[PDB]
Amino acid sequence: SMKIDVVTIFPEYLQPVRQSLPGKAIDAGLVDVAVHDLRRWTHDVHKSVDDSPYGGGPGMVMKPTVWGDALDEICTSETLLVVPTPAGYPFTQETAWQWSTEDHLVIACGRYEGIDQRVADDAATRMRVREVSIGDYVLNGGEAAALVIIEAVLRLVPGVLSLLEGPSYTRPPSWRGMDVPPVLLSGDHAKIAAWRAEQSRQRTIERRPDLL
Amino acid sequence: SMKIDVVTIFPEYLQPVRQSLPGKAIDAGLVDVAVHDLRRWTHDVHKSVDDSPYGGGPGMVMKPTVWGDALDEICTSETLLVVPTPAGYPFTQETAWQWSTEDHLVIACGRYEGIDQRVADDAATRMRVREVSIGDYVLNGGEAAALVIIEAVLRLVPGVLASLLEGPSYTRPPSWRGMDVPPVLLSGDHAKIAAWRAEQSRQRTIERRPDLLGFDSP
Numbered sequence: 556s557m558k559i560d561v562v563t564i565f566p567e568y569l570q571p572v573r574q575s576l577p578g579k580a581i582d583a584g585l586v587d588v589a590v591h592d593l594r595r596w597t598h599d600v601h602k603s604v605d606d607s608p609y610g611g612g613p614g615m616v617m618k619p620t621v622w623g624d625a626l627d628e629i630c631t632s633e634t635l636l637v638v639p640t641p642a643g644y645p646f647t648q649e650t651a652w653q654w655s656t657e658d659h660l661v662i663a664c665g666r667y668e669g670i671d672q673r674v675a676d677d678a679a680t681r682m683r684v685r686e687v688s689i690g691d692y693v694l695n696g697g698e699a700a701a702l703v704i705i706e707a708v709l710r711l712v713p714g715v716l717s718l719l720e721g722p723s724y725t726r727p728p729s730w731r732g733m734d735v736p737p738v739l740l741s742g743d744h745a746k747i748a749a750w751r752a753e754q755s756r757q758r759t760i761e762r763r764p765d766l767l
Numbered sequence: 768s769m770k771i772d773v774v775t776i777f778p779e780y781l782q783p784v785r786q787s788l789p790g791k792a793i794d795a796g797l798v799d800v801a802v803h804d805l806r807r808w809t810h811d812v813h814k815s816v817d818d819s820p821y822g823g824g825p826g827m828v829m830k831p832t833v834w835g836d837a838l839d840e841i842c843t844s845e846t847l848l849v850v851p852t853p854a855g856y857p858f859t860q861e862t863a864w865q866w867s868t869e870d871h872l873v874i875a876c877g878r879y880e881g882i883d884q885r886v887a888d889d890a891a892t893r894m895r896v897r898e899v900s901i902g903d904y905v906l907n908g909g910e911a912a913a914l915v916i917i918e919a920v921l922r923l924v925p926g927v928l929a930s931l932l933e934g935p936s937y938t939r940p941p942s943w944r945g946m947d948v949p950p951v952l953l954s955g956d957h958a959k960i961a962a963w964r965a966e967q968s969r970q971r972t973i974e975r976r977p978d979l980l981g982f983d984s985p
């Protein structure tokens with residue numbers, strides 16, 4: 556069984572992935588995804604989640620007192636706390652495999668310039684904390700990153716959801732003047748495998764030379 | 768003014784586009800985002816969008832005929848056709864800057880094992896086509912990739928407006944749970960604050976992303 560708790564100021568962002576879980580998996584207790592509005596843990600009538608950065612400059616920083624109360628309530632000693640951030644370690648398929656056998660993931664979704672660093676520092680003294688980037692681009696908030704992480708992790712949990720793969724084809728054999736490569740129809744399955752390997756090599760050279 | 772069309776067999780999965788920054792840019796009229804159900808272009812009783820691969824292998828491939836009809840209707844020669852795929856060129860901040868100047872993005876979201884390669888090949892005979900990966904992991908579908916791409920592009924479009932990681936940030940109170948904000952940040956010395964932030968950035972980068980500074984990855 557896996558529990559995923561997401562904490563966010565935009566809880567509606569995660570509702571479609573919640574509803575996408577198959578009922579059989581939920582009923583079997585294989586997976587439970589819960590979403591929490593961070594504003595439940597604000598202190599003031601204005602429900603403030605952010606404040607000006609120490610040292611100056613633009614933007615805002617999310618408040619440690621609010622996040623600290625949220626994580627105190629949601630996390631336990633078994634929690635793996637995931638903090639999406641463009642300044643994080645890379646989230647990769649290896650990470651997804653590792654996290655797919657965790658009992659409890661908590662995803663803390665940030666906004667503005669991120670979460671006051673003492674939140675992660677303090678949490679790390681009582682649980683495991685993982686600051687991760689999903690790619691070399693900047694989002695406005697952690698919610699889209701949470702969606703990517705949830706999808707990549709949960710498709711590796713049974714019954715829930717080096718070289719590049721080459722092109723794929725289906726019927727019809729000829730379409731808009733373009734034929735499916737005839738080798739694929741040849742019934743020479745060793746040759747087909749070699750053809751696919753060369754297609755993957757060429758595609759990796761063209762698109763991802765870093766991988767070779 | 769930008770137009771983004773998203774084509775998917777799961778249109779409800781794109782509802783998050785109405786939240787947060789993409790939602791506000793939608794409300795401000797700077798961008799119009801339309802989501803289309805690919806099954807609208809099917810003709811059979813069962814609305815079939817997939818068929819088994821040629822050459823063997825597991826899974827299913829999205830049929831070219833249905834996609835070709837959809838893109839015929841939605842795209843023009845001016846369109847930038849975005850095809851998310853883990854086998855694509857990397858989508859990066861540079862890509863986001865480039866696409867932020869485009870008049871029309873169409874995002875073709877795959878499912879199953881992906882879309883028959885001739886769909887992209889055919890589209891490229893009349894428009895620009897970009898097959899892109901959003902990262903070194905595997906999603907079940909292109910819908911989450913579309914949301915990432917839309918968010919990263921929309922925050923750059925004029926009307927809403929480096930090679931290093933940003934260091935840590937702090938806000939009030941100055942002491943919390945016995946944990947202090949670094950004193951330099953409280954000191955008011957702008958030059959010492961700038962130098963500390965630059966050092967924190969470079970130290971975080973070599974620890975977390977040594978590749979960005981030209982060092983081996985672990």
Ligand SMILES: Nc1ncnc2c1ncn2[C@@H]1O[C@H](CSCC[C@H](N)C(=O)O)[C@@H](O)[C@H]1O
Binds near residue numbers: 665
């Ligand atoms: N590449 C990425 N990977 C994971 N999370 C990201 C991300 N890019 C942005 N985020 C999320 O979005 C939040 C704000 S981005 C932080 C800086 C600010 N957006 C700016 O540059 O002006 C982050 O704290 C993180 O939660």
Ligand SMILES: Nc1ncnc2c1ncn2[C@@H]1O[C@H](CSCC[C@H](N)C(=O)O)[C@@H](O)[C@H]1O
Binds near residue numbers: 850851876880882903
């Ligand atoms: N890293 C990534 N970047 C962009 N899109 C991705 C992606 N991973 C998955 N997708 C999307 O999800 C769809 C199905 S994944 C495609 C099959 C894959 N070879 C597999 O291992 O099963 C793709 O066609 C693409 O639209």
